[PDB]
Amino acid sequence: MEIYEGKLTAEGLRFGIVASRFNHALVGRLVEGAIDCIVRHGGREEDITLVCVPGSWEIPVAAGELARKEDIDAVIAIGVLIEGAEPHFDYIASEVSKGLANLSLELRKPISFGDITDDELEEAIECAGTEHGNKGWEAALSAIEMANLFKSLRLEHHHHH
Amino acid sequence: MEIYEGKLTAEGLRFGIVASRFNHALVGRLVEGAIDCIVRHGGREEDITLVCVPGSWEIPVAAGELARKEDIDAVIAIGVLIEGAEPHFDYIASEVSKGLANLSLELRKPISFGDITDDELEEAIECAGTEHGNKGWEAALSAIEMANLFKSLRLEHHHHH
Amino acid sequence: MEIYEGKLTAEGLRFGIVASRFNHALVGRLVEGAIDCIVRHGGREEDITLVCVPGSWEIPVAAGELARKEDIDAVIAIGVLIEGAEPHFDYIASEVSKGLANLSLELRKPISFGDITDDELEEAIECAGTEHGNKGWEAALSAIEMANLFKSLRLEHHHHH
Amino acid sequence: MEIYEGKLTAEGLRFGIVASRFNHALVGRLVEGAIDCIVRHGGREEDITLVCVPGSWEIPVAAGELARKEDIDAVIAIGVLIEGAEPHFDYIASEVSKGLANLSLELRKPISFGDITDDELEEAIECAGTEHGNKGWEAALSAIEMANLFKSLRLEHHHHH
Amino acid sequence: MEIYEGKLTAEGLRFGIVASRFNHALVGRLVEGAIDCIVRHGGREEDITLVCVPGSWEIPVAAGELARKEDIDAVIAIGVLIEGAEPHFDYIASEVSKGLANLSLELRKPISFGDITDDELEEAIECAGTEHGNKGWEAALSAIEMANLFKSLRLEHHHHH
Amino acid sequence: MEIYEGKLTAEGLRFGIVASRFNHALVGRLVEGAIDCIVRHGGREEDITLVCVPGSWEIPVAAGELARKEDIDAVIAIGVLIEGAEPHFDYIASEVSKGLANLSLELRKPISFGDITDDELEEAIECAGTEHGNKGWEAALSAIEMANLFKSLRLEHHHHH
């Protein structure tokens, strides 16, 4: 049987990061954690492409362009939703969840979810200190595994050629 | 500033693995943990050199050989010490720690400590089937980071020459 | 009479700093203090050599490398050990105490002990702000004196020649 | 991947047996146990080398010579530490354990602890009969295992060269 | 029989003195007593080498240089450890014992142990008056005797030569 | 089976003796104890060598000198430690204990531990008495048995050639 998955090497890969700037105290935390696991897993940072946006709403629209550049292999979602504004949390979080979903299925490119849905800002003051449970860290890793996967999937597509 | 830190790509490295066979219900579990983090951090699995021995006692006399090979860049300590005979847990666990340490200083070669000090066997059974808590995975990681750090130390020496 | 001592100038000198990343909450604070004393007490930071590692275990093996390079005059050992796991604070801390010791005596090179043994994060914060008690600050001072002292030993050796 | 472990046939091998002559009441039972499994796991007994000495103290210095012969492959250790004299029991048992440990690392030649640490004459007699626990028996077994493991080690290096 | 012991004449001998300046109120008391007995037993005070360091920790690394001079026949260990920091008194004091021990055994050059272990400062001040428990007085005298002894040992070798 | 042990005939052997002169109230007794067992076991005394030092501390460095001469076959530790100060009895007894041990493994020369570690002055009165348990008598004999043994080891090596 033929198995496919990705090792976690960030070698030869160019990454995408989008991030809100609502609640930037904790977003500072997540951006770091992602960028680390990139670079410390071999990634060079000159090809990480990073976009800020105002609020959670605009995360889709931006990622949509980011994934459409040829040279961005995977794109890392980053946004923060604490239960501040409830209609905007149920509708916008499910609409971004879905929105990202369609972007990937359509564009044929992995998009990770580094979106901290903290019911309680008390969970946010826990990781803003020093804890490594850094959702940016780990969603960044999943993006690498996908990245090397579709690098591995489509490489066996075009080298067998 | 000159900063040296370990990046986690196991690319091009040849690992040393030393294993006890006392309590192998869980040692088989740990060695898996090490090999996985190894290859799934980009290292190849043909250049892993694995050795087993009766009990934790000969762990040192083992690695003393493996580390003297020029083509093994790091040695991973593996064993399980469950509190079986207190003469053997206080004195042998202390001799493992002290013994492996002196090898490392002496050969100038990173040796990792994957020894599980569990108080009983039921904790050993729990960790081999309920969580990724896998001390082998992690001693496998620290030797990777040391492998690139020392290959960063001595190679920043050798090419700058 | 002939008396040898060392002033507190960091001029003409190249230092080593070894850093663990366990409990990094406090490590940021102490390496900061350490680099404060060097550059403020006459040193330029261009020859401060900073090597980082996982946990307290790997401290020795690193400094032993920093001491085998010709142009590192003193190495500032820095890490935090907190009473987590009694197996690891007793045996690992004395193995650091001893391991560093026999390093310097063998290599004939001063290595100082900036290892804060604390029981609470609050004991770390107290020492981080302004209480002039950053123990890395002091370890940086002691090593400066030893560096200029050994520069005073070795230079009064080669100049009288 | 390459695996090394250890088979139990003692053929082609030449052993070292070092033994105290204090408490020889139970020592007679172990010496027989040792040469029992050697001859009985295929070894001939003409190449067994038996050195007797005063008390558990002289154990190391003797083994030091036995391992320094080319045609002695493994040095099985035989001594009894019954709680007679407590300063001699803690200080000399840990110093035998340590002194042996360093001997094996230094000479890169396997050494086995066939030393029965008993608090009573009752525990000494029980296992010295036929209850599967004649510590000389397992000492000689693990020693054969490291003999074929090391001959598997260095002979897999020297023959693959 | 061939017996060797040393007289106490300080004539023709060049000494080492290492001094911690932790607790200097009594340390000055000591070195006075030291150089006193040296000079009174006929030896000139210009061949004294006196080295100053911070706290008890560096005591080793200083002497290690002092001995590697061809022209220092013996070295006088001088420092005071008062129970200030008990982790620092167990590890530093014992490490002073061992570290100095092994330097002397290694260089085959004697190092005395002018170490005052006081719990209370009053027991210090009481012992430097005229009864000459001025521990430096005695550690100085031991160094003289050992000095003449190794000059008695090796010189009964090189002149009989 | 190849067996090595030793007769007790001191014919042809040249011995080493180191003696502390602290508490000479017992040291004279033991010193003579060894000389007796030597010559009354056939050995001449023009080949015995006695060195005297201040205290228990210096016995290591001396034996290291005595064992390095070509014409000394075995060395006799001699000292009495009375519990005068717990820093000096615990540290100096274990430090000389191990210290002598490592000398022997290192110089490949047998050292007997001719120490009387008495917790009280009464135990000091028991062991230098009439019952022919004169620790010097005994450790002298252990040295002769080990002297003829390593003469049996190295002779069964050198003459078989």
Instruction: Give burial (CB, 10 Å; 0-12/13-18/19+) of C46.
Output: exposed
**Token match 């076991």: residue?**
F41
**Closest approach of B44 to chain C, Cα-based (Å):** 23
> How far is D115 from D139, CA to CA, in rounded Å?
9
Q: What value does the CA radius of gyration of chain C take, rounded to a whole number of Å?
A: 16
Nearest to A11 among B6, B9, B40 (CB): B9
CB D102 within 8 A of CB B106: no
> How far is A39 from A55, CA to CA, in rounded Å?
27
- Cα maximum dimension of chain A: 54
Q: Which residues pair with D52 in a beta bridge?
A: D19
> How far is A97 from A59, CA to CA, in rounded Å?
10
DSSP alpha helix (H) spans, A4-161: 24-40, 59-66, 87-107, 121-127, 135-158
**Closest approach of C159 to chain A, Cα-based (Å):** 47
| 3-class SS shares of chain F: helix, strand, coil, % to 5 | 50, 15, 35
Q: What are phi and psi of E4, to 5 degrees?
A: -130, 125
DSSP per position, F25-67: HHHHHHHHHHHHHHHTTT--STT-EEEEESSGGGHHHHHHHHH
DSSP per position, E107-149: HT--EEEEEEEESSHHHHHTTSSTT---HHHHHHHHHHHHHHH
Residues written for chain A: 161
Query: How are strands ordered across the β-sheet holding C15-20?
Result: B2-4, C49-53, C15-20, C74-82, C111-118
A11/B8 CB distance under 8 A: no
CB D49 within 8 A of CB D110: no
Cα atoms in the 13 Å half-sphere on the side-chain side of A142: 14
**Cα–Cα distance list, A10 to A160, C27, D88, D95, E31 (Å):** 23, 28, 59, 50, 62
**Closest approach of C25 to chain A, Cα-based (Å):** 6
Instruction: Give burial (CB, 10 Å; 0-12/13-18/19+) of C159.
Output: exposed
- Listed in sequence order, the residues at least 6 apart from A9 whose beta carbon sits closer than 8 Å to its beta carbon are A41, A42, A144, A148, B9, B11, B41, B42
Q: What are phi and psi of F150, to 5 degrees?
A: -70, -25
Q: Find, in chain B, the residue whose alpha carbon is nearest to that of D116.
A: B87
Structure tokens that stand for A131 in this block: 């804890």
Q: Identify the H or E element spanning E51.
A: strand E49-53
CB C153 within 8 A of CB C4: yes
CB A132 within 8 A of CB A30: no
**Token match 């000398």: residue?**
F103
Using CA atoms in the order A128, A132, A133, A134, what is the torsion angle rounded to 10 degrees?
Answer: 60
Q: How many CB atoms lie within 10 A of CB A24?
A: 13
**Cα–Cα distance list, B28 to B20, B24, B57, B66, E45 (Å):** 10, 6, 18, 20, 69
Q: How was this structure determined?
A: cryo-EM
Nearest to B99 among D2, D101, D145 (CB): D101
Residues of C in contact with E65 (CB under 8 A): 108, 150, 153
Residues written for chain F: 161
Q: Find, in chain C, the residue whose alpha carbon is nearest to that of B117.
A: C87
> How far is C110 from C107, CA to CA, in rounded Å?
9
Q: Which residues pair with B19 in a beta bridge?
A: B52, B78
CB F50 within 8 A of CB F19: yes
Chain B to chain C Cβ contacts (< 8 Å):
67
Chain C to chain E Cβ contacts (< 8 Å):
57
Q: Convert B22-59 to b/e letters by CB count within 10 Å (16 or more is b).
A: bbeebbebbbebbbbbbbbbbbeeebbbbbbbbbbbbb
**Closest approach of C2 to chain E, Cα-based (Å):** 6
- Cα maximum dimension of chain D: 53
Using CA atoms in the order C15, C21, C22, C25, what is the torsion angle rounded to 10 degrees?
Answer: 90
Structure tokens that stand for D139 in this block: 């000492």
Task: Select the residue from B40, B132, B141 to test the A interface by mutation, using most A Cβ atoms within 10 A.
Answer: B40
Q: Which residues pair with F79 in a beta bridge?
A: F115
**Cα–Cα distance list, D71 to D74, D110, D139 (Å):** 9, 13, 20
Q: Which residues pair with D111 in a beta bridge?
A: D75
Using N-to-C axis directions, what is the helix angle for D86-107 and B59-66, rounded to 10°?
20
Structure tokens that stand for C101 in this block: 């010791």
C108: left (phi over 0), alpha (psi -120 to 50) or beta: left
Per the annotation, the verdict on B161 as an active-site residue is no
Residues of E in contact with F94 (CB under 8 A): none
Q: What value does the CA radius of gyration of chain B take, rounded to a whole number of Å?
A: 16
Using N-to-C axis directions, what is the helix angle for D135-159 and B59-66, rounded to 10°?
10
Q: What are phi and psi of E90, to 5 degrees?
A: -65, -55
DSSP alpha helix (H) spans, E71-115: 86-107
Q: What value does the CA radius of gyration of chain E take, rounded to a whole number of Å?
A: 16
Closest Cα to residue B149, out of A38, C51, C69?
C51
Q: Which residues pair with C80 in a beta bridge?
A: C116
> How far is C10 from E160, CA to CA, in rounded Å?
51
Closest Cα to residue C50, out of C82, C28, C80, C70?
C28
- Listed in sequence order, the residues at least 6 apart from A154 whose beta carbon sits closer than 8 Å to its beta carbon are none
Q: Identify the H or E element spanning E74.
A: strand E74-82
- Listed in sequence order, the residues at least 6 apart from A28 whose beta carbon sits closer than 8 Å to its beta carbon are none
> How far is A62 from C37, CA to CA, in rounded Å?
46
Single-letter amino acid, residue A122: E
> How far is E75 from E63, CA to CA, in rounded Å?
7
> How far is F54 from F51, CA to CA, in rounded Å?
11
Annotated catalytic residue, options E88, E157, E160, E161? E88
**Token match 């579709």: residue?**
A150
- State whether the Cα torsion C153-C155-C158-C159 is positive or negative: negative
Structure tokens that stand for A161 in this block: 């050629």
- Listed in sequence order, the residues at least 6 apart from D140 whose beta carbon sits closer than 8 Å to its beta carbon are D15, D33, D34, D35, D36, D37, D38, D76, D112, D114
> How far is C58 from B101, CA to CA, in rounded Å?
9
> How far is F59 from F78, CA to CA, in rounded Å?
8
Using N-to-C axis directions, what is the helix angle for C86-107 and B86-107, rounded to 10°?
30
Structure tokens that stand for F83 in this block: 């519990």
Q: What value does the CA radius of gyration of chain A take, rounded to a whole number of Å?
A: 16
Nearest to B64 among D1, D108, D154 (CB): D108
Interface residues from chain C to A (CB-CB < 8 Å): 23-25
Using N-to-C axis directions, what is the helix angle for D135-159 and D24-40, rounded to 10°?
40
